[PDB]
Every structure is written in C-alpha cells, then in structure tokens.
Amino acid sequence: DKTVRWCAVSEHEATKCQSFRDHMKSVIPSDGPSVACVKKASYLDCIRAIAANEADAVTLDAGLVYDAYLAPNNLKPVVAEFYGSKEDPQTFYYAVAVVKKDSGFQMNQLRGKKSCHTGLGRSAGWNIPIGLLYCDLPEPRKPLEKAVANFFSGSCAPCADGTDFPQLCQLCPGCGCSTLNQYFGYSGAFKCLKDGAGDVAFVAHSTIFENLANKADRDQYELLCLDNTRKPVDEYKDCHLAQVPSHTVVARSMGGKEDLIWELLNQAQEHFGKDKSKEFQLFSSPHGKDLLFKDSAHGFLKVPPRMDAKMYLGYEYVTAIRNLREGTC
Ligand SMILES: [Fe+3]
Ligand SMILES: [K+]
C-alpha cells in the first residue's frame, strides 16, 4: 500500500494528525501517499512502536533522535525540518535560557533557582543546559537526574521519573511526557516561567516569539548569556547556549518506508506548508504549538541515503551528548 503510519503523542497531536490525514486525502490522488494515525502517550512509545513495525514515522528533537538510534531500536533519521526560510534553509536552531527581567541572576548563579525544561533528553531543554552546568552540579553527579534535582530548588523535567526524582516534577507534578502536561515542551516550559513556577526556561530562540505576540510583553523577559550577562530576547544570536540540529523524522532501518515518508512530507509541504493553505497548516495548529512538527519549521529536507543518527547529527552534538553522560570535572 501507501499509508505512512504517523505516531502522534497524545490528544492534541492526534487531532492535528487526523486533520493532516483528512486534508491530504482531499488533495492527493488515490495514487499518492496517505497518512494513518497511531496515538501514543509518549515519544518513547512511538520509538518502540516504530521498531516493532506498529508505526512508521515520528518527528523527534535531535537529542531524542540520538536516543532512538541506540540499541535495541536503531531507528534512522530520514527527513529533517528546516527553519529560517525556503530561500536560506537552516538545519539548526538556537538553545537559549529565558528568564524574567529584573530577576537578578546570571548563568553562574542558577544554583538554588527553579527550572523549566522542555523534556528530559531534549537539545535545548536538557542536553545543552545540563551539559554546560554539569560541573556546577553537586556530587555525586550520577545519576544525573538527581544531581540536577539537587542543584535547582524545584523543576519541571517532563518525562523524568517522579518516583525516583520527585523534585524534577515539583513545577509540574507527574512530569507528564506529552501536551497533557501543560508545562511540557517548548510552549510548556515557557508557560512554566510565565506563570511564575520557574525562574528559567530552557527552550529555543523562537519559543518566546511564538508564545508572546506583544513586544512590550517580551521586553519583560531576557536571555542568560554564557559570559554571565543578560541580553534582550531578540539578541539570541549573540546570547545563546549553543546551536543544535533540527528536529528530525525517524524510521526503521529495515522496511522503514523512508521513500514513502519523504514522498508524503514533500507533497505535504507543497499543499500545506508555510502560507500554502487556508484549510490546513503543517507548521501551526488551532489545537496547540509544535504538534507533530515544530511551528518554527518552514519545510523538509531529505536525509542522504542510509545515513545514521551519528553521522547526521554531527560529531560536535554527538560529543556533547556523550560528554554529558560520560564526562567529568
Ligand atoms: Fe528541540
Ligand atoms: K534541591
């Protein structure tokens, strides 16, 4: 057949996935690619389902793309999101640390503060910030989740085990690993800061602009720069923690339908990409932000043939993840 089983994480994404399915059906000849929706409680279940031949595709943050490639799943990156514009595609985005203006603390004064993370293992929300703060964390630094919980005075790290690490869910009881948790992901980590639960939100450079439409409102927030200074949210290019690779669609290595997945997404971006349709949009939704794909994405780029997560992500980001897990001071 020609159906790509897409893995939607929870109700909000499932809704957008069904709309994705219906709209594609309304414009695609019965000759082209179709989309079926498989709903899961977490991205972890999506990875398992795909390896088990129960689903075919799911978009993951780069940190999770790395995790998906590890045994026994061994998933491969097949289609990447790109940002910026079609004219000059960016296969990366900036990891930033958003804070409220006048809160009186720098990067080197994060100990004792409250943190809002997009999710455990994610680029901007975990890998990058925790990697930079690693040696500041109290010993024993392993397990990492506990050292981080001990460092801050309460946090929200979605997908973390609230039984083993209670304080990592102090700002979002249960540490839900989906949009059901209002403090999950980019928009959720930011809401965690805006509502007053946290002192810092580890998100992407575009998150505040996507969740705060007014400039006067944004002026009440700032970014923590690596040199222990603060700068306006519009100056993320000169005040970020690191550049990280795009969120990417992964699939099985064997019988993964990578060709159909690309065919589906390439046709999907033409019909429902940025500014393409008044009926449906792949990169936004009335049901929420960053559902299925990031709202900041402008399109898709095909990953070279047979490329694995390690080669795709690049030695630098891979080394960043390995240093986090293995490294010391
Ligand atoms: Fe991300
Ligand atoms: K603590």
Side-chain angles (χ1 to χ4, degrees):
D1 247 322
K2 274 275 238 317
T3 294
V4 174
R5 294 169 296 179
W6 206 275
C7 197
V9 181
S10 201
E11 262 23 90
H12 298 115
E13 292 205 338
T15 298
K16 183 177 175 173
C17 185
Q18 181 56 221
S19 296
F20 181 21
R21 175 179 183 98
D22 295 342
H23 288 268
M24 279 301 285
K25 203 178 307 182
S26 73
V27 296
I28 193 66
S30 72
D31 325 354
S34 291
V35 195
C37 303
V38 178
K39 187 182 61 182
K40 297 295 184 186
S42 162
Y43 76 91
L44 276 176
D45 302 328
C46 283
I47 294 174
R48 174 174 54 255
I50 294 172
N53 193 29
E54 292 178 342
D56 301 310
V58 71
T59 314
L60 297 171
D61 164 88
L64 303 184
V65 167
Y66 179 84
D67 286 4
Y69 129 99
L70 303 172
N73 303 297
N74 313 114
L75 302 187
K76 305 197 302 97
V78 296
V79 181
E81 291 176 354
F82 76 77
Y83 318 97
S85 62
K86 291 95 167 61
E87 295 72 72
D88 187 40
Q90 294 182 295
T91 51
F92 68 91
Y93 56 95
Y94 303 90
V96 298
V98 188
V99 292
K100 287 187 172 175
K101 189 182 185 185
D102 305 319
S103 59
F105 67 87
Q106 302 296 353
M107 196 74 194
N108 61 0
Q109 299 169 321
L110 279 172
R111 177 183 293 107
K113 298 308 174 181
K114 295 192 164 52
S115 59
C116 305
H117 310 264
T118 58
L120 210 69
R122 292 171 61 150
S123 300
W126 185 264
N127 296 340
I128 301 305
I130 303 309
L132 289 167
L133 297 164
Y134 190 70
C135 291
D136 292 326
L137 306 185
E139 296 177 67
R141 298 187 181 88
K142 189 150 189 169
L144 187 61
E145 291 78 8
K146 189 61 186 303
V148 169
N150 289 156
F151 184 77
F152 293 113
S153 63
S155 335
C156 173
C159 319
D161 195 305
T163 307
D164 298 299
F165 323 108
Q167 197 155 21
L168 284 189
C169 313
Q170 183 175 323
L171 276 41
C172 61
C175 282
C177 198
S178 75
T179 62
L180 256 189
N181 174 183
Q182 68 167 156
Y183 294 143
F184 163 87
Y186 290 116
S187 53
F190 183 76
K191 192 179 186 295
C192 167
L193 169 70
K194 193 217 63 173
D195 286 351
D199 297 302
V200 63
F202 296 115
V203 294
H205 71 272
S206 69
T207 68
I208 188 166
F209 302 99
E210 297 171 349
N211 300 99
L212 218 49
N214 289 306
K215 210 267 184 182
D217 286 315
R218 299 199 293 275
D219 289 329
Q220 305 313 121
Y221 290 87
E222 297 176 303
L223 301 179
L224 301 173
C225 318
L226 259 25
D227 65 338
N228 304 120
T229 66
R230 285 178 175 213
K231 288 185 185 181
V233 298
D234 282 324
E235 302 181 18
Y236 56 86
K237 292 190 176 221
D238 305 288
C239 184
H240 62 261
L241 305 198
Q243 285 170 43
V244 301
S246 312
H247 281 208
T248 311
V249 182
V250 297
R252 281 181 302 287
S253 188
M254 182 173 285
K257 300 184 182 172
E258 66 290 324
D259 55 335
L260 300 182
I261 288 164
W262 168 246
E263 185 187 335
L264 175 71
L265 297 184
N266 193 43
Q267 286 190 39
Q269 73 177 327
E270 293 202 341
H271 280 112
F272 313 110
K274 224 78 168 197
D275 296 277
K276 303 320 311 309
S277 181
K278 292 276 282 186
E279 286 66 73
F280 183 72
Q281 300 80 41
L282 276 175
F283 312 112
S284 69
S285 67
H287 315 291
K289 310 201 184 308
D290 304 317
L291 306 179
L292 304 180
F293 307 103
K294 290 176 59 161
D295 279 14
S296 62
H298 274 254
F300 301 115
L301 292 178
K302 198 188 192 309
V303 174
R306 297 171 200 103
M307 191 175 276
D308 59 289
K310 253 170 63 265
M311 190 185 285
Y312 170 74
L313 295 176
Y315 197 80
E316 192 164 325
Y317 186 64
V318 174
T319 298
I321 296 182
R322 288 197 304 241
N323 274 178
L324 176 66
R325 324 208 157 168
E326 306 248 346
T328 292
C329 346

Coordinates of all heavy atoms in Angstrom, one line a residue, residues 4 11 14 21 25 38 43 45-46 51 54 58 65 88 90 108 117 129-130 140 146 154 163 176 253 257 262-263 317:
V4 N 1.5 5.8 5.4 CA 2.6 6.1 6.4 C 1.9 6.2 7.7 O 1.0 7.0 7.9 CB 3.3 7.4 6.1 CG1 4.3 7.6 7.2 CG2 4.0 7.3 4.8
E11 N -3.6 13.4 22.7 CA -4.8 14.0 22.1 C -4.6 15.2 21.2 O -5.2 15.2 20.1 CB -5.8 14.4 23.2 CG -7.0 13.4 23.4 CD -6.7 12.0 22.9 OE1 -6.2 11.1 23.7 OE2 -7.0 11.7 21.8
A14 N -2.9 14.1 18.0 CA -3.8 13.1 17.4 C -4.8 13.9 16.6 O -5.2 13.4 15.5 CB -4.5 12.2 18.4
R21 N -4.4 13.9 8.0 CA -4.9 12.7 7.2 C -6.1 13.1 6.2 O -6.0 12.8 5.0 CB -5.4 11.6 8.1 CG -6.1 10.5 7.3 CD -6.6 9.3 8.2 NE -7.1 8.2 7.5 CZ -6.5 7.1 7.1 NH1 -5.2 6.9 7.5 NH2 -7.1 6.2 6.4
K25 N -6.0 13.6 2.1 CA -6.9 12.8 1.3 C -7.7 13.6 0.3 O -8.0 13.2 -0.8 CB -7.9 12.1 2.3 CG -8.5 10.8 1.8 CD -9.4 10.2 2.9 CE -8.6 10.0 4.2 NZ -9.4 9.3 5.3
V38 N -1.4 6.9 14.6 CA -1.2 6.0 15.7 C -0.9 6.9 17.0 O 0.1 7.5 17.0 CB 0.0 5.0 15.5 CG1 0.2 4.1 16.7 CG2 -0.3 4.2 14.3
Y43 N 6.8 9.9 23.4 CA 7.6 9.7 22.3 C 8.3 8.3 22.4 O 8.7 7.7 21.5 CB 8.7 10.8 22.1 CG 9.8 10.6 23.1 CD1 11.0 9.9 22.7 CD2 9.7 11.2 24.4 CE1 12.0 9.7 23.6 CE2 10.8 11.0 25.3 CZ 11.9 10.3 24.9 OH 12.9 10.0 25.8
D45 N 7.0 5.6 23.5 CA 6.2 4.5 23.0 C 6.2 4.6 21.4 O 6.0 3.5 20.8 CB 4.7 4.7 23.5 CG 4.6 4.7 25.0 OD1 5.4 4.0 25.6 OD2 3.7 5.4 25.5
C46 N 6.4 5.8 20.9 CA 6.5 5.9 19.4 C 7.7 5.2 18.9 O 7.6 4.5 17.9 CB 6.5 7.4 19.0 SG 4.9 8.3 19.1
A51 N 10.0 0.5 15.9 CA 10.9 -0.6 15.8 C 10.1 -1.9 15.7 O 10.6 -2.8 15.1 CB 11.8 -0.6 17.1
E54 N 4.8 -1.2 14.2 CA 3.4 -0.8 14.6 C 3.1 0.6 14.2 O 1.9 1.1 14.3 CB 3.2 -1.1 16.1 CG 3.2 -2.7 16.4 CD 3.0 -3.1 17.8 OE1 3.2 -2.2 18.7 OE2 2.7 -4.2 18.0
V58 N 7.8 9.4 13.1 CA 7.6 10.3 14.2 C 8.8 11.3 14.2 O 9.9 11.0 13.9 CB 7.6 9.6 15.6 CG1 9.0 9.1 16.0 CG2 7.1 10.5 16.7
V65 N 16.6 11.9 18.8 CA 17.0 11.2 17.5 C 18.2 10.3 17.9 O 18.2 9.1 17.5 CB 17.4 12.2 16.4 CG1 18.1 11.5 15.3 CG2 16.1 12.9 15.9
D88 N 16.8 30.5 2.4 CA 18.0 30.1 3.1 C 17.7 29.2 4.3 O 17.6 29.6 5.4 CB 18.7 31.4 3.6 CG 20.1 31.2 4.2 OD1 20.9 30.3 3.7 OD2 20.4 31.8 5.2
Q90 N 17.7 26.7 7.3 CA 18.6 26.5 8.5 C 18.3 25.1 9.0 O 17.2 24.8 9.4 CB 18.3 27.5 9.6 CG 18.6 28.9 9.2 CD 18.3 29.9 10.4 OE1 17.1 30.0 10.8 NE2 19.3 30.5 11.0
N108 N 25.9 31.7 36.0 CA 26.7 31.2 37.1 C 26.1 31.3 38.5 O 26.7 31.1 39.5 CB 28.1 31.8 37.1 CG 28.1 33.3 37.3 OD1 27.0 34.0 37.4 ND2 29.3 33.9 37.3
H117 N 12.1 22.8 32.0 CA 12.7 22.1 30.8 C 11.7 21.6 29.9 O 10.6 21.2 30.3 CB 13.6 21.0 31.3 CG 14.5 21.3 32.4 ND1 15.8 21.6 32.2 CD2 14.4 21.4 33.8 CE1 16.5 21.9 33.3 NE2 15.6 21.7 34.3
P129 N 21.8 22.8 28.3 CA 21.9 23.5 29.6 C 22.6 22.6 30.7 O 23.4 23.0 31.4 CB 20.5 23.9 29.9 CG 19.7 22.9 29.2 CD 20.4 22.8 27.9
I130 N 22.1 21.3 30.8 CA 22.7 20.5 31.8 C 24.2 20.2 31.5 O 25.0 20.1 32.4 CB 21.9 19.2 31.9 CG1 20.4 19.5 32.3 CG2 22.4 18.3 33.0 CD1 20.2 20.5 33.4
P140 N 27.3 13.3 44.6 CA 27.5 12.6 43.4 C 26.7 13.1 42.2 O 25.5 13.3 42.3 CB 27.1 11.2 43.7 CG 26.0 11.4 44.7 CD 26.6 12.5 45.6
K146 N 19.1 13.2 39.4 CA 19.1 13.5 40.8 C 20.1 14.7 41.2 O 19.7 15.5 42.0 CB 19.5 12.3 41.7 CG 19.3 12.5 43.2 CD 17.9 12.8 43.6 CE 17.7 13.2 45.0 NZ 18.2 12.1 45.9
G154 N 13.8 23.1 42.7 CA 12.5 22.6 42.2 C 12.5 22.8 40.7 O 13.0 23.9 40.2
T163 N 9.0 9.3 40.7 CA 9.2 8.4 41.8 C 10.6 8.5 42.3 O 10.9 8.6 43.5 CB 8.8 7.0 41.5 OG1 7.5 6.9 40.9 CG2 8.8 6.1 42.8
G176 N 4.6 14.7 33.2 CA 4.0 14.1 32.0 C 4.8 14.3 30.8 O 5.3 15.4 30.6
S253 N 15.2 1.0 10.0 CA 16.3 0.8 9.0 C 15.8 -0.2 8.0 O 16.1 0.0 6.8 CB 17.5 0.2 9.8 OG 18.6 0.2 8.9
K257 N 10.1 2.4 5.0 CA 9.2 3.3 4.1 C 9.8 4.7 4.0 O 9.0 5.6 3.8 CB 7.8 3.3 4.7 CG 7.0 2.1 4.8 CD 5.6 2.4 5.3 CE 4.8 1.1 5.5 NZ 3.5 1.4 6.1
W262 N 9.2 10.4 2.7 CA 9.7 11.6 2.0 C 8.6 12.1 1.0 O 8.3 13.3 0.9 CB 11.0 11.4 1.4 CG 11.4 12.5 0.4 CD1 11.5 12.4 -1.0 CD2 11.6 13.9 0.7 NE1 11.8 13.7 -1.5 CE2 11.9 14.6 -0.5 CE3 11.6 14.6 2.0 CZ2 12.1 16.0 -0.5 CZ3 11.9 16.0 1.9 CH2 12.1 16.6 0.7
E263 N 8.1 11.2 0.3 CA 7.1 11.5 -0.7 C 5.8 12.1 -0.1 O 5.3 13.1 -0.6 CB 6.6 10.2 -1.5 CG 5.7 10.4 -2.6 CD 5.2 9.1 -3.2 OE1 5.9 8.0 -3.1 OE2 4.1 9.1 -3.8
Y317 N 27.7 17.6 18.2 CA 26.5 17.4 19.0 C 26.5 16.0 19.7 O 26.2 15.9 20.9 CB 25.2 17.6 18.2 CG 24.0 17.5 19.1 CD1 23.7 18.5 20.0 CD2 23.0 16.5 18.9 CE1 22.6 18.4 20.9 CE2 21.9 16.3 19.7 CZ 21.7 17.3 20.7 OH 20.6 17.2 21.6

